[PDB]
DNA sequence: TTTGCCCGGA
DNA sequence: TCCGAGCGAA
DNA sequence: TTTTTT
């Protein structure tokens, strides 16, 4: 009924590892358009959203939409059991109690079959409406991740501030404070390393360091990361894919002082 | 405004808003000019203004901008073992004081030291307290400590010796009615004469409890939507006070002295959920101020009530303790 | 410990002794000279420096092809329980 | 330190700098000064209650022995430092067995608040102390001898710091008054000495608070009224009024009197109990049973107060305890 | 769920059916809930305290408060030992029983609760901007079982973060609640229903379940045997119906739980035989009760009030028994090994008889 | 600012700090117009480290008035790790400062990383401890001293150095036995860096704790030659020369039991 | 004169 | 699937 | 997780 063959299993393994620490049980709503998933974390400070597109898969077809509830730990274990060079295929029937994973290698000699039991997860419906954010920024993921790793060593909270041609990451702690200031920069020879900034209103927000540490694990998916910030919304972290994206909506810390 | 419970909404903002602790607030206010604040030990019963006082003092000393860099606050919600005292607290006490800005220096006294607030210090182990002793003395040049507690005997003698003691007095109708009336007027609460003083009498020295009781009564009155005054009977109902008729029934059962009758009445009485501590308090008031009982009876009952109150303070079964007390009174 | 026991004395449970061989090589018809008697003295003294030792010794008491003698002072201790059904118990009392 | 010494609390601003500024411990000071003079410094133990001058004395001794640069020539450890077995075997043993970096001479190790060390560390210290005596001397300081091992106690020369007597406190107060331009009445000085229980820290803290409580410290005089105000303590007259009412009046009047006296200045119940116990100790009683009942019941009430409880019930308990005990007097 | 005590539990303040004045007070609190103080509900067991807490939360946040799920949260002790806590949650509130972790309950207060207090939450079902515009609510069950350290850890969290969090604590007695915590709470007394209210509730169940009932007096008997415990009365009604083929009769007897029967047998034994051998047999009975999850305080209470009901004892015996019960109830509070104190109580009682 | 000192590459300062990190915890830097000096003393007060960095180690340097910066070495090393070995590292301080600013800036991009480390109120003199006329002064390559120390430390917790006419002797006596290395002065004009130099007025014999020497040899990464100065009554001086300044260890010898 | 549950590993 | 280590932790 | 001896 439903079958989805990836060009390479490494892509799927990386996507799964991206958000497996934030959430463990999740429903994938496979549709003719593609796979769309949305999960809330246990503490409800984080929403993860996935919109893998049809173009991402090497081949894909699912006539009737089907929801597959699965635990990410077992899927990660099965993917680890698989080889680096493989064309992972997910197979499911009209009313599947399990999903079949086929690791078809380039050489026909190597063929592997696995079965993963599905689950019945009571997942509600979430309406994520687009919002006019106060600021948008885009920058390489290695840089952002290095900033987060360095600043988390100084404090439990990291403050992101955006003002006119200035992006500021700050962390204050017992031994002192650390700050990184980036400016909008464009490199024609190497566009992938450019820093882009759209600024409508000044923004300042604070986030738990552990959450940003969890989020930066998605850097592998996309060489660039987009961050959208508003005074009243959660902060949106987007890693683009070939046709989909991995999305993190993070609530900020409660501002006790103000 | 409309989002704060009244106890937090009306927390004193400055030292002049603390109402009945002048004997200590005066000493503290003098250090805005003398700039030689000693190590402090605030102690006293619940809801008397200790945390409010230390916070207001730090604000007055450093201004809103420079406060954060000059304060280390650690309370019972934080981990405060001996390793914490030996590393985090010591390291903060060692540091140079944050530089004040010119504006800060113009608008605030800016003394040349920082402050470490150990709120609820009576929950710290004796060994961690011991580890504080020489840190307090060696770094007095740049750091001053403020320990806050309800039970002063839980602080080890060396630390009590190092600290300057400030006892916070119980707040009653005599010395807190002005503040309670101010809050009542700010919130437009209509009350009969006697009601605010009755609130403070019920609170038994705790102004936080009195304010919360006033807020509950005003919520009741607003819900009723009739514009009438809050009465003392309503306040007593909100405060879990036993109605005088029920107490008289208890007293008559005790007078009769029949064990089975007292037992059955107490069993029925417990079903109402009356707090045993309030019952014992009301019985104490009834008997000790009664001209119909003689000296020997009152001596014996005073000891009985003391014993039962002590046993209840340990978290015991209220039914058992109350029945024992009533039987013993009946056999006097 | 279990590791040291498995890497050491274990190999002698079913092995001839080279010392025994060369001691009685000249002696004719010496059947016992080439075989081991394994003595594990002071079993009750095996503390945390011998993790897993007592269980492994009980295993050996079941799976040895050469005679094994264990010695302890406090037989009734709880840690000596594993030996219960696999050893020939010989009590020594205070002499008169 | 920061800015002047005038920014310091009086308990630290008046810390003795030399042995001549340590008061009320004359026998100890004489003995140790002549130890230093003759070059015979044994291993020392300073034992005593809080605020009697132990740390002050040992630091003054180090300053005298080594001069102004003493701090880089001694090893000072206290309860704010880790002093487990590993520290004894590495840091302490290395310092004891090695020459000075800065200036030639013998080593001094000061174990302040030694009652905070474990038994194992103290036992490790025994042969360190004995083996390196030729070049190193230890000084141990404590408030509680029972946490010190017998072996450690054997190896030290013991010196007991007494609660500071009246004359020493009076002289120190005179020095403070001169330096602060303060005036103190005789009754106020008596009240201060009485409430300090021979702890100089209490004297200095109370005196600083009293100065802060004056309107004009240049002209205003610290009277006993000021002391009681800043300490929130009962006047002797209040204590006597309460005790008289308890011993001579009916229950209604005694309850009324206790409540009214307490309400006058917001007095705490435990302070009244302490004061009345001090008064009753001097009573001559016919029956030993009166003393027994008084002491046991009042100790029970004090213990219950330490855990909180109902203040009104505890006050009535005090009244009843005293009345019932004196009934035995017949 | 299917059992009648659960099938007919009310889900709103309008569906409550006893103690009308308390219902009015709760409605008054829910009228303007933005400045609601922290709450502490107290009263006898099984009267409807948690039912009313849930009804209040429904009145504030809507029916969504009843869409519950359970999740396991991990913690580590200083000694590096792993611990798990089951947390019940709706979109609007959390429910925890920190006493589940025993003496480590303090950790739950210092890490989990604090975290909830310091964070904002997302919400993509009620908020137009993805953030929840409301304080977070935490129910703490069995609050009188918290150790003193955990209660202390609550104190400043309740004040500092009052903007973002409100606590509802539920307990059957306030005696073990430290004074600073009670000072911080609005105390709500929850009395037991009268016997008429219980009879009305039981009659409604009898009608909705098509149970044959010879006379209404039967319900009254049940109501009287439950001593104001409404949960007990509903469960007893169901058990009696099950044992009488869904047809209650005036002769149908009241069913007592197994542990109660054992304790009554122990009372008869203590009264009949006062001796060392009897005390040894009593120790056996006490171990049996404790091993099967009958708490020591429950055993002491039940034994004391069973003894005081014995018709053959005189006033002197009964006064001695209640004194000994008071003393050893304090001992149980202050100690660890319950059997020690229970045995001491039984020995003193045997001596007094 | 009042103090501005720019290292071309942060790696220089990181290696200098790592040269003595393991022996001490708290360090006091005094910055003056002629450069930065620093002192620290180990926990047991047996070892003292003295660092000197001249203005030539810096691409740019400016210190209007003398200033003292006390700090914990673990925090400083943690911060130094957060920056890249290639970026330019500017130390910045203001008059009467509460913190020291470490500014990592790379010219390739416009990325500035500014760290502020809070300073301690460490009031202690340096005393310029250096005896005028040491009894014996020797110098030898760092690798050979490291090898001798490492070999002899496996045998005993203490190492004795004996200097006599034209001979340097290291000795260690322990549980499994003893070891003794004897070297002689020698000048090799083909490879001066391998030379062993020895000048001496009074013969010397001093014992040292092995763990301290094992810490001291970590300076070998900063210099190819180590100089050793010994006297009967003074701490032993182990000096490693930097391109601009120096790193000195003053180690007190054991008491003659 | 030594219990009950039941580890980590096979 | 079987076995009991080590700790008392309801 | 370990207080004292004569
Ligand atoms: N002296 C006071 N003056 C004005 N308000 C007071 C005073 N004391 C208590 N309150 C009120 O009660 C609330 C609690 O005051 P706190 O200072 O926090 O009491 P507390 O002495 O710290 O209580 P504990 O020891 O933590 S139980 C304040 O926010 C005020 O609203
Ligand atoms: N004999 C004394 N003479 C003068 N001042 C004293 C004396 N004793 C205590 N003080 C004063 O009280 C302060 C504390 O003195 P310390 O010598 O540190 O007390 P201590 O005996 O070490 O108390 P413990 O045992 O650490 S609680 C000093 O700084 C002095 O101001
Ligand atoms: N019909 C009705 N049943 C109630 C009411 N209050 C409580 N109950 C029932 O009594 C049961 C016990 O109530 P519960 O809140 O769990 O008791 P508590 O939390 O221990 O005080 C519930 O499961 C309900 O079925 C009420 O007001 N009306
Ligand atoms: Mg407080
Ligand atoms: Mg001292």
Determine the straight-line distance between the first and last CA of chain E, rounded to whole angstroms: 48
CA distance D39 to E37: 71
What are the structure tokens assigned to D251, written together?
Answer: 């229950």
Q: Return the percent helix, strand and coil in chain A, to nearest 5.
A: 20, 45, 35
E212-213 and E247-248 strand pairing: parallel
Secondary structure class of D27 (helix, strand, coil): helix
CA distance A52 to A54: 7
Q: Which residues contact E197 (CB under 8 A, 6 or more apart)?
A: E17, E18, E19
Please say whether the beta carbons of C33 and C20 come within 8 A.
yes
> Are B293 and B149 in a shared domain?
no
Interchain proximity B99–F118, CB inside 8 Å: no
Please say whether the beta carbons of D79 and B128 come within 8 A.
no
Buried residues in E32-62 as b, exposed as e (16+ CB within 10 A)? ebebbbbbbbbbbebbbbbbbbbbbbbbbbe
Q: Which residues contact A23 (CB under 8 A, 6 or more apart)?
A: A39, A40, A41, A48, A72
Task: Give all strands of the β-sheet with A135-140 in edge-to-edge order.
Answer: A66-71, A25-30, A35-40, A46-50, A245-250, A235-240, A224-229, A135-140, A196-199
Please say whether the beta carbons of C35 and C66 come within 8 A.
yes
Task: Give all strands of the β-sheet with D107-111 in edge-to-edge order.
Answer: D74-77, D107-111, D136-142, D44-47, D157-160
Q: Which phi and psi (to 5°) does residue F180 adopt?
A: -150, 120
Task: Give all strands of the β-sheet with B114-118 in edge-to-edge order.
Answer: B71-74, B114-118, B143-149, B40-43, B164-167
E strands within chain A?
2-6, 25-30, 35-40, 46-50, 57-62, 66-71, 87-92, 98-104, 111-117, 135-140, 157-163, 166-172, 176-182, 196-199, 203-208, 224-229, 235-240, 245-250
> Are B71 and B6 in a shared domain?
yes
F123 CB within 8 Å of a chain D CB: yes
Please say whether the beta carbons of B38 and D205 come within 8 A.
yes
Q: Which residues contact E98 (CB under 8 A, 6 or more apart)?
A: E85, E105, E108, E109, E140, E146, E150
CA distance D236 to D233: 9
Closest residue, CA to C1' of H9: E102
Please say whether the beta carbons of B223 and B46 come within 8 A.
no
CA distance F133 to F199: 12
Helices within C12-92 (DSSP H only) = 18-23, 53-63
> Are B176 and B316 in a shared domain?
no
What's the DSSP call for residue B187?
T
CA distance E232 to E229: 5
Provide the shortest C-alpha distance from residue B72 to chain F (in Å).
15
Please say whether the beta carbons of F236 and F47 come within 8 A.
no
Exposure of C32 by Cβ count < 10 A (0-12 exposed, 13-18 middle, 19+ buried)?
exposed
Q: For E293 and G3, how far is CA from C1' in angstroms?
A: 19
- Residue the block writes with tokens 């003083």: B197
Please say whether the beta carbons of F257 and D132 come within 8 A.
no
Determine the straight-line distance between the first and last CA of chain F, rounded to whole angstroms: 54
C-alpha torsion sign, points A197, A198, A202, A206: negative
CB atoms within 10 A of CB A124: 11
CA distance A70 to D81: 53
**Residue C91, phi-psi category: left (phi > 0), alpha (psi -120 to 50), beta (remainder):** beta
Closest-CA residue to A101 (of A75, A121, A127, A119): A75
Determine the straight-line distance between the first and last CA of chain C, rounded to whole angstroms: 38
Chains D and F touch (3+ CB pairs under 8 A): yes
**Minimal Cα distance from F249: which residue of D?**
D101
Please say whether the beta carbons of F242 and F55 come within 8 A.
no
Q: How far is CA B26 from CA B19, D139, D213, E28, in A?
A: 12, 42, 7, 42
Q: Is B240 annotated as a binding residue?
A: no
Q: Return the percent helix, strand and coil in chain E, to nearest 5.
A: 55, 15, 30
CA distance E352 to F182: 92
Q: How would DSSP label each residue in B254-308? A: HHH--HHHHHHHHHHHHTT---HHHHHHHHHHHHHT-TTS-HHHHHHHHHHHHHH
Closest-CA residue to F223 (of F71, F51, F33): F51
E strands within chain D?
44-47, 74-77, 107-111, 136-142, 157-160
**Residue F236, phi-psi category: left (phi > 0), alpha (psi -120 to 50), beta (remainder):** beta
Closest-CA residue to A230 (of A184, A162, A170, A167): A162
Q: How far is CA D252 from CA D234, D237, D248, in A?
A: 22, 21, 12
Q: How far is CA B247 from CA B151, B254, E265, in A?
A: 32, 11, 36
Q: Which phi and psi (to 5°) does residue E273 adopt?
A: -125, 115
F36 - beta bridge partners? F31, F53
Interchain proximity F98–B99, CB inside 8 Å: yes
Q: Which residues contact E10 (CB under 8 A, 6 or more apart)?
A: E16, E17, E51, E55
CA distance D102 to D73: 7
What are the structure tokens assigned to D181, written together?
Answer: 């331009």
**Geometric angle at alpha carbon A141, from A136 and A143, rounded to 5°:** 100
C-alpha torsion sign, points A194, A200, A202, A207: negative
Secondary structure class of A236 (helix, strand, coil): strand
Contacts E173 to B, Cβ<8 Å? 317-318
**Minimal Cα distance from E87: which residue of A?**
A42
Buried residues in B212-245 as b, exposed as e (16+ CB within 10 A)? bbbbbbbbbbebeeeeeebbbebbbbbbbbbeee
Q: How far is CA C81 from CA A216, C42, C44, D48, F248, in A?
A: 55, 15, 11, 54, 63
> Are B198 and B269 in a shared domain?
no
The CB-side HSE value for E164 (13 A sphere, CA atoms) comes to 21
Please say whether the beta carbons of B161 and D205 come within 8 A.
no
> Are B290 and B210 in a shared domain?
no
CA distance B6 to D149: 56
Closest-CA residue to B11 (of E185, E162, E32, E180): E162
Mutate to test the pocket of ligand 1, among B9, B12, B73 (most ligand atoms within 8 A of CB): B12
Determine the straight-line distance between the first and last CA of chain A, rounded to whole angstroms: 55
Determine the straight-line distance between the first and last CA of chain D, rounded to whole angstroms: 64
What's the DSSP call for residue C41?
-
Buried residues in B99-119 as b, exposed as e (16+ CB within 10 A)? ebeeebeeebebbebbbbbbb
Q: Which residues contact C73 (CB under 8 A, 6 or more apart)?
A: C42, C44
A102 - beta bridge partners? A89, A113
Which helix (DSSP H) or strand (DSSP E) does residue B164 occupy?
strand B164-167
Closest-CA residue to D22 (of D184, D171, D189, D166): D171
Atom of ligand 2 nearest to the CA of D161: 21
Interchain proximity D101–F123, CB inside 8 Å: no
What's the DSSP call for residue B194?
T
Q: Which of residues 187-216 of D touch B (CB under 8 A)?
A: 199, 201-202, 205, 208-209, 212-213
Q: How far is CA F133 from CA B32, B215, F162, in A?
A: 56, 84, 18
Quote the ligand 2 centre to B43 CA distance (angstroms).
23
CA distance E286 to D34: 71
CA distance C39 to B61: 79
Please say whether the beta carbons of A42 and A211 come within 8 A.
no
Provide the shortest C-alpha distance from residue A174 to chain B (in Å).
8
- Residue the block writes with tokens 């003893």: F178
Contacts B94 to F, Cβ<8 Å? 120-121
Exposure of E23 by Cβ count < 10 A (0-12 exposed, 13-18 middle, 19+ buried)?
middle
Q: Which domains does chain E have, with CATH numbers?
A: 4-189 (3.40.50.300), 195-248 (1.10.8.60), 258-352 (1.20.272.10)
Quote the ligand 5 centre to E88 CA distance (angstroms).
52
Q: Which residues contact B213 (CB under 8 A, 6 or more apart)?
A: B199, B202, B203, B235, B238, B239
Q: Which residues contact F133 (CB under 8 A, 6 or more apart)?
A: F201
CA distance F89 to F112: 10
**How far is residue E258 CA from its own chain's centroid?**
20
Q: For E96 and H9, how far is CA from C1' in angstroms?
A: 21
What are the structure tokens assigned to E10, written together?
Answer: 């009310």
What are the structure tokens assigned to A90, written together?
Answer: 């997910």
CA distance B34 to D212: 8
B302 - beta bridge partners? none
What's the DSSP call for residue D185?
-
Question: What are the extents of the domains in chain F?
Answer: 1-257
- Please tell me the residue having the least CA distance from ligand 2 atom 31: D15
The CB-side HSE value for B289 (13 A sphere, CA atoms) comes to 12
> Are B164 and B212 in a shared domain?
no
Closest-CA residue to A78 (of A86, E113, B42): A86
Exposure of E277 by Cβ count < 10 A (0-12 exposed, 13-18 middle, 19+ buried)?
exposed
CB atoms within 10 A of CB B61: 22
When computed from its CA atoms, the radius of gyration of chain E, rounded to whole angstroms, is 23
Q: Which residues contact A76 (CB under 8 A, 6 or more apart)?
A: A13, A16, A17, A20
Q: Which residues contact D239 (CB under 8 A, 6 or more apart)?
A: D272, D275, D276, D279
Largest CA distance in chain C: 48
Q: How far is CA D189 from CA D171, D287, F29, in A?
A: 11, 36, 49
Q: Which residues contact E144 (CB under 8 A, 6 or more apart)?
A: B315, E171, E172, E173, E174, E175, E176, E177
D63 - beta bridge partners? none
Nucleic acid strand I: bases within 7 A of protein CB: 2-5
Q: Which of residues 154-183 of D touch B (CB under 8 A)?
A: none
Buried residues in E230-244 as b, exposed as e (16+ CB within 10 A)? bbbbbbbbbebbeee
CA distance E153 to E139: 16
C-alpha torsion sign, points D178, D183, D187, D192: negative
Secondary structure class of D311 (helix, strand, coil): helix
What are the structure tokens assigned to B202, written together?
Answer: 């019920």
Pocket of ligand 2 (CB under 6 A): B 158, 161; D 11-12, 14-16, 22-25, 50-56, 143, 164, 172, 200-201, 204
**Geometric angle at alpha carbon F80, from F79 and F83, rounded to 5°:** 95
When computed from its CA atoms, the radius of gyration of chain B, rounded to whole angstroms, is 25
Helices within chain B (DSSP H only) = 6-9, 22-34, 50-70, 82-84, 90-94, 102-107, 126-138, 157-162, 173-186, 195-203, 207-224, 232-238, 244-256, 259-270, 276-288, 295-313, 318-330
**Geometric angle at alpha carbon A96, from A91 and A102, rounded to 5°:** 20
> Which residues are close to ligand 4, an ion, with C-beta < 5 A?
B 51
**Minimal Cα distance from F250: which residue of D?**
D101
**Geometric angle at alpha carbon E153, from E147 and E159, rounded to 5°:** 135
CA distance E113 to B77: 10
The structure was resolved to a resolution in Å of 2.1
Q: Return the percent helix, strand and coil in chain C, to nearest 5.
A: 40, 5, 55
Closest-CA residue to F27 (of F6, F50, F44, F46): F50
**Residue E336, phi-psi category: left (phi > 0), alpha (psi -120 to 50), beta (remainder):** alpha
Please say whether the beta carbons of C52 and C1 come within 8 A.
yes
Number of residues written out for chain C = 96
Exposure of F185 by Cβ count < 10 A (0-12 exposed, 13-18 middle, 19+ buried)?
middle
Q: Of B223, B241, B259, which marks where a domain is finished?
A: B241
Secondary structure class of F241 (helix, strand, coil): strand
Q: Which phi and psi (to 5°) does residue B315 adopt?
A: 85, 30
E strands within A52-105?
57-62, 66-71, 87-92, 98-104
Q: How would DSSP label each residue in E277-295? A: HHHHHHHHHHHHHHHTT--
The number of distinct structural domains making up chain B is: 3
Secondary structure class of B147 (helix, strand, coil): strand
> Are B119 and B48 in a shared domain?
yes
Please say whether the beta carbons of A90 and A104 come within 8 A.
no
Domain carrying residue B180:
172-241
**Geometric angle at alpha carbon D80, from D77 and D86, rounded to 5°:** 60
CA distance D316 to C50: 65
Q: How far is CA C15 from CA A111, C6, C20, in A?
A: 47, 14, 11
E118 CB within 8 Å of a chain A CB: yes
């Amino acid at each position: 009924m439903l079958e989805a063959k990836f060009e390479e299993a490494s892509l799927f393994k990386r996507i799964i590892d991206g958000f497996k620490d934030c959430v463990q049980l999740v429903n994938f709503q496979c549709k003719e358009d593609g796979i769309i998933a949305q999960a809330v974390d246990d503490s409800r400070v984080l929403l993860v959203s996935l919109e893998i597109g049809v173009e991402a898969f090497q081949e894909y077809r699912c006539d009737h939409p089907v929801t597959l509830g699965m635990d990410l730990t077992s899927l990660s274990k099965i993917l680890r059991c698989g080889n680096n060079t493989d064309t992972l295929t997910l197979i499911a029937d009209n009313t599947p109690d399990s999903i079949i994973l086929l690791f078809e290698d380039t050489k026909k000699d190597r063929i592997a079959e696995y079965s993963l039991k599905l689950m019945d997860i009571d997942a509600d419906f979430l309406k994520i409406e687009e919002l006019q954010y106060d600021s948008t920024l885009s920058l390489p993921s290695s840089e952002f991740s290095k900033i987060v790793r360095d600043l988390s060593q100084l404090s439990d909270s990291i403050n992101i501030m955006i003002t006119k041609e200035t992006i500021k990451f700050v962390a204050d702690g017992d031994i002192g404070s650390g700050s990184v200031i980036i400016k909008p920069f464009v490199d024609m020879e190497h566009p992938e390393t450019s820093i882009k900034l759209e600024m409508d209103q000044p923004v300042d927000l604070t986030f738990g360091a552990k959450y940003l540490l969890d989020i930066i694990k998605g850097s592998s998916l996309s060489d660039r990361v987009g961050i959208r910030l508003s005074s009243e919304a959660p902060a949106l972290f987007q890693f683009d894919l070939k046709s989909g994206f991995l999305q993190f909506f993070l609530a900020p810390k409660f501002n006790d002082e103000e | 405004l409309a989002q704060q419970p009244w106890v937090e909404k009306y927390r004193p903002k400055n030292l002049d808003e603390v109402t009945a602790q002048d004997h200590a607030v005066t000493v503290l206010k003098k250090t805005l000019k003398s700039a030689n604040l000693p190590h402090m030990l605030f102690y006293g019963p619940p809801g008397t203004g200790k945390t409010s006082t230390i916070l207001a003092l730090t604000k007055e000393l450093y201004g809103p901008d420079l406060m954060k860099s000059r304060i280390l606050e650690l309370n019972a919600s934080d981990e405060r073992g001996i390793s914490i005292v030996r590393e985090k607290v010591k390291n903060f006490a060692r540091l140079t004081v944050s530089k004040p800005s010119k504006h800060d220096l113009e608008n605030y006294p800016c003394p040349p030291y920082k402050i470490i607030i150990l709120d609820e210090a009576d929950s710290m182990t004796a060994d961690a307290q011991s580890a504080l002793r020489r840190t307090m003395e060696t770094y007095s040049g740049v750091t001053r400590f403020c320990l806050i507690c309800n039970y002063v005997t839980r602080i080890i003698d060396p630390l009590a010796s190092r600290c300057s003691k400030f006892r916070f007095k119980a707040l009653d109708a005599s010395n807190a009615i002005d503040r309670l009336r101010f809050i009542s007027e700010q919130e437009n609460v209509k009350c009969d004469d006697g009601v605010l003083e009755r609130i403070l009498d019920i609170s038994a020295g705790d102004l936080r409890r009195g304010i919360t009781l006033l807020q509950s009564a005003s919520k009741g009155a607003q819900y009723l939507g009739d514009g009438k005054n809050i009465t003392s009977t309503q306040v007593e109902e909100l405060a879990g006070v036993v109605p005088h008729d029920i107490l008289i029934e208890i007293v008559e059962k005790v007078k009769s002295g029949d064990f089975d009758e007292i037992k059955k009445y107490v069993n029925t009485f417990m079903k109402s959920g009356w707090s045993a501590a309030s019952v014992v308090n009301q019985l104490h008031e009834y008997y000790i101020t009664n001209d119909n009982f003689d000296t020997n009876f009152k001596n014996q009952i005073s000891w009985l009530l003391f014993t039962t109150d002590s046993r209840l303070n340990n978290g015991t079964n209220e039914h058992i303790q109350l029945l024992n007390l009533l039987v013993k009174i009946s056999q006097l | 410990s279990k590791t040291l026991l498995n890497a050491g004395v274990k190999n002698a449970l079913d092995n001839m002794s080279v010392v025994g061989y060369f001691k009685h090589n000249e002696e004719a018809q010496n059947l016992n000279g080439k075989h081991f008697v394994i003595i594990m003295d002071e079993v009750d003294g095996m503390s945390g420096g011998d993790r897993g030792g007592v269980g492994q010794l009980a295993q050996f008491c079941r799976k040895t092809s050469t005679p094994l003698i264990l010695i302890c002072n406090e037989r009734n201790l709880p840690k000596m329980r594993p030996f219960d059904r696999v050893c020939l118990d010989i009590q020594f009392r205070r002499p008169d | 330190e920061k800015r002047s010494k005038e920014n310091l609390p009086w308990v630290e601003k008046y810390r003795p700098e030399t042995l001549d500024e340590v008061y009320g411990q004359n026998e100890v000071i004489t003995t140790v000064r002549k130890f230093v003079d003759e070059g015979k410094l044994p291993h020392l133990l300073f034992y005593g209650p809080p605020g009697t001058g132990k740390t002050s004395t040992i630091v003054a001794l180090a300053r005298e022995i080594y001069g102004k640069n003493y701090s880089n020539m001694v090893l000072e450890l206290n309860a704010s430092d880790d002093r487990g077995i590993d520290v004894v075997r590495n840091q302490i043993k290395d310092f004891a067995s090695t020459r000075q970096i800065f200036s030639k001479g013998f080593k001094l190790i000061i174990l302040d608040e030694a009652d905070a060390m474990t038994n194992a560390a103290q036992n490790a210290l025994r042969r360190v102390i004995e083996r390196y005596t030729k070049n190193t001397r230890f000084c141990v300081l404590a408030n509680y001898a029972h946490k010190l091992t017998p072996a450690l106690l054997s190896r030290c020369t013991r010196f007991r710091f007494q609660p500071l007597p009246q004359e020493a406190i009076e002289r120190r107060i005179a020095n403070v008054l001169v330096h602060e331009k303060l005036k103190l009445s005789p009754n106020a000085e008596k009240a201060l000495i009485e409430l300090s229980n021979g702890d100089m820290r209490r004297v200095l803290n109370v005196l600083q608070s009293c100065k802060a409580t004056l309107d004009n410290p240049d002209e205003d005089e610290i009277s006993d009224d000021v002391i009681y105000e800043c300490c929130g303590a009962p006047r002797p007259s209040d204590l006597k009024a309460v005790l008289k009412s308890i011993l001579e009046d009916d229950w209604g009047t005694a309850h009324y009197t206790l409540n009214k006296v307490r309400s006058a200045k917001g007095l705490a119940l435990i302070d009244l109990i302490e004061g009345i116990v001090k008064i009753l100790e001097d009573y001559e009683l016919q029956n030993e049973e009166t003393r027994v009942h008084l002491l046991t019941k009042l100790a029970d009430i004090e213990y219950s107060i330490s855990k909180g409880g109902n203040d009104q019930i505890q006050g009535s308990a005090v009244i009843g305890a005293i009345k019932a005990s004196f009934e035995n007097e017949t | 769920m299917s059992l009648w005590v659960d099938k007919y539990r009310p889900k709103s303040l309008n569906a409550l059916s006893h103690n009308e004045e308390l219902t009015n007070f709760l409605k008054s609190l829910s009228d303007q809930p933005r400045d609601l103080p922290h709450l502490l509900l107290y009263g006898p067991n099984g009267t409807g305290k948690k039912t009313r807490c849930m009804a209040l939360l429904e009145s504030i946040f809507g029916p969504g408060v009843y869409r519950l799920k359970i999740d396991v949260r991990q913690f580590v002790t200083a000694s590096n030992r792993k611990l798990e806590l089951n947390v019940v949650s709706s979109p609007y509130h959390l429910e925890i029983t920190p006493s589940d972790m025993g003496n480590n309950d303090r950790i739950v207060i210092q890490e989990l609760l604090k975290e909830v207090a310091q964070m904002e939450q997302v919400d993509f079902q009620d908020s137009k901007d993805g953030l929840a515009h409301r304080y977070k609510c935490v129910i703490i069950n069995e609050a009188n079982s918290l150790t003193k350290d955990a209660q202390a850890a609550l104190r400043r969290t309740m004040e500092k973060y009052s903007k973002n969090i409100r606590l509802i604590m539920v307990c059957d007695s306030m005696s073990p609640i430290i004074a600073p915590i009670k000072s911080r709470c609005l105390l709500i007394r929850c009395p037991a229903p009268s016997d008429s209210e219980i009879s009305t509730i039981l009659s409604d169940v009898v009608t909705n379940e098509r149970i044959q009932l010879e006379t209404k007096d039967i319900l009254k008997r049940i109501a009287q045997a439950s001593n104001g415990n409404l949960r007990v009365s509903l469960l007893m009604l169901e058990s009696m119906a099950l044992n009488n083929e869904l047809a209650l009769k005036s002769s149908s007897p009241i069913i007592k739980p197994d542990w109660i029967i054992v304790i009554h047998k122990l009372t008869r034994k203590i009264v009949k035989e006062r001796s060392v051998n009897s005390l040894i047999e009593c120790r056996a009975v006490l171990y049996d009760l404790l091993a099967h999850c009958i708490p020591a305080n429950i055993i002491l209470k039940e034994l004391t009030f069973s003894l005081l009901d014995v018709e053959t004892l005189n006033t002197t015996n009964k006064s001695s028994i209640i004194e000994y019960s008071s003393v050893f109830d304090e001992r149980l509070s202050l100690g660890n090994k319950a059997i020690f104190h229970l045995e001491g109580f039984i020995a003193k009682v045997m001596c007094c008889l």
